[PDB]
Amino acid sequence: AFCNLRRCELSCRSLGLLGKCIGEACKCVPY
Structure with missing residues (x-):
């Protein structure tokens, strides 16, 4: 995975x- x-x-x-992760990069989430 990329x-x-x-x-x-x-x-x-x-x-x-x-x-x-989201396709090709990663982002933070509070959920």
Whole structure:
């Protein structure tokens, strides 16, 4: 897969959110 999900999710965990991939990049979500 073309997206670093774990590296995103642990970054979002600083902000208190979850990380989710979207095609070719990753974004944080509070859900």
